[PDB]
UniProtKB/Swiss-Prot annotation, chains A, B, C, D, E, F:
Gene of this entry: hutP
Pfam families listed in its UniProt record: HutP
Coiled-coil positions: none
Name the UniProt record assigns to this protein: Hut operon positive regulatory protein
Organism per entry: Bacillus subtilis (strain 168)
Record's keyword annotation contains RNA-binding: yes
């Protein structure tokens, strides 16, 4: 079995070449995809943005603690990577872009309910002068 | 075309297909490259392997602790990413297969203060449960 | 010695059969008991509710950093369990009941000052539709 | 009478007295039960013991990874609870005695989507100091 | 090599005898010093106070993610010590003094860029009645 | 002149020069002292060494667990400080040299409820990278 939901989510996040085509390629292969961008690294904002863009994309249904809890946790896991192990400081981070991806589906060929979600995050921390000063990555993977 | 060493690091790491050509273009574009793999997630083990495999090539200069230390911190941040926390509850001699990519060059955004160095980690940790592996991911960027 | 202050606090928390009788049974056996309920899983709210209900019950005296610090820490420890390792998310948790217990006294027969406190928490995370969707537990034990 | 699998799990775990009758009533009420004990806090060790002791009885079906994996995650969450963090500073071959309770059935609240599975852990970790043991507690609930 | 930037920062923090003379002694020895005091243990406040007093003292230049990130992290590291492993609670801590020190320079004789920063923090947690009830310490050391 | 046992602890610990005179003045001022050193960062190892070296002198009375336990908790808090978290990723038999200072007396601020006990830790952990050591620091204060 080689359906790396994590690897996938990160590749979708970086391959901005033709993400339009990638999302469908993956969509038809039993995946629920969602790409988005947030201009903050504050935990609450990121979650709200991801959640919204997740429900509005059918990646997660509008109500249900179960799925929200999974997205939330995978998201939190990935935020620890993008904020460089300092959650609290991500909030303080000004002038920062965050691109996110979220994949949901079976991590393997077993038709059985093996339903996982992956939240990949790509951060660009820049300043008014130059533009990019430091990049950050994060990945969270949880079963639903 | 962007000169994002981090993004490049992960793309190089995450695309096993024709790493040869991917590496050729990177070397051809003023980047020093270095790929590898390690069966240990142990700090000591990972850092030795990386430091060694990087010096052998033209990544860092085997001479002063300056470039060496810069590699260490980038690798630590990267490892700190692979050793999320749940994998931390996994202290029982497991089958861990890490693959790494090291990229050293200059994010020539505007100025060329100096060189930068990125370390990307990706592998799969076996689960104590049969037929189950976890994906781990980590990135560490530092200024030489 | 078998005075499990933790085991006790959890049993008091679940045995809603006749908690009225349990509290006295334990009260007379050198214990300072306190039961309460909070309609949130946000750290600050829980602490404020527990603290208040703790002082007003004589389980902790109104002023004194020492005792507050112990209750606070045991509480924090138990919150990590009830929020399923995700403090921050407990705050975001809507429609959620939290029942708490707090015991204070000697964990053993040594009349010497062996004074500990235990905060047991039982969480019920429900939604407007059904009612219960997931339960959570947490326990914190600190010496004063 | 409530059908809270979690609450039941902990009550079964925390009441050693006449577990026989407690188990009888649970089995008689459409629940699959399973008790045990383990002298290791090591993930690998705990999960093996639990998975094995649960399959032997009618908890999960020894056949597919579906029920097996569901047991794993519930046990991990539970263990993640026993390995709070202070016990994490305790990596020196200590005397740890964990007792576990596994309950698999259906929280028949309204609908019967499917079965649920809860794992309760309770034990006592010896302290590096003479005459002192710490109580550990953890619960993990999952949907089959 | 014996330039203990950490040891130094703590000694400067406690030696209130003649800190006026110490700061210069160290200033002339390739160090960027900064002493300050905050009447809170809330993460955000401490960081804002330290940052401000850090830039206004030339210990860190006004703009630049790199240096801010280092101070921020060392600060965060030291706060975990002063709040006794409970970040969140430090915020709740009322009637509390925090003295801080910050050193920046080369941790060794290698003229090469070995540039680190250390944030030492000394906390005094008192009440309206007596005055001091408990003291706390924290130290963070990061390379820039 | 202040009677801050913590501050004194760290000063005693951090000043190796003429510890003899520093100790003389402390003993002469109603304080019980105790210095030492340990090559292990292992809880079990550190606590044994400290507990033993403290009983030999007039720090705690080798008789009851009361003073013994009080020493344990203070040492744990202190160790919890030395085992920050990054040193936690360092589980590979490293060269760790901890030095400790134990001070037991009475912070006679106003009242003399009873005695207090402080434990200070300072050492240097070797890095997996050549020519690099990390400083560790921790303090734990407890009421006898």
């Amino acid at each position: 079995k080689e359906r790396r939901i994590g690897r996938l989510s990160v590749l979708l996040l970086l391959n901005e070449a033709e993400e339009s085509t990638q999302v469908e390629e993956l969509e038809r292969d039993g995946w629920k995809v969602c790409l988005g961008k947030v201009g903050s690294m504050d935990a609450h904002k990121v979650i709200a943005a991801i959640e919204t863009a997740s429900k509005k994309s059918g990646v997660i249904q509008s109500e249900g603690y179960r799925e929200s809890h999974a997205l939330y946790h995978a998201t939190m896991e990935a935020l620890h990577g993008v904020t460089r192990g300092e959650m609290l400081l991500g909030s303080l981070l000004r002038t920062v872009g965050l691109r996110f991806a979220v994949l949901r589906g079976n991590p393997y060929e077993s038709e059985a309910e093996g339903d996982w979600i992956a939240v990949s995050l790509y951060g660009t921390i820049g300043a008014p002068i130059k533009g990019l000063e430091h990049e950050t990555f994060g990945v969270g993977i949880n079963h639903i």
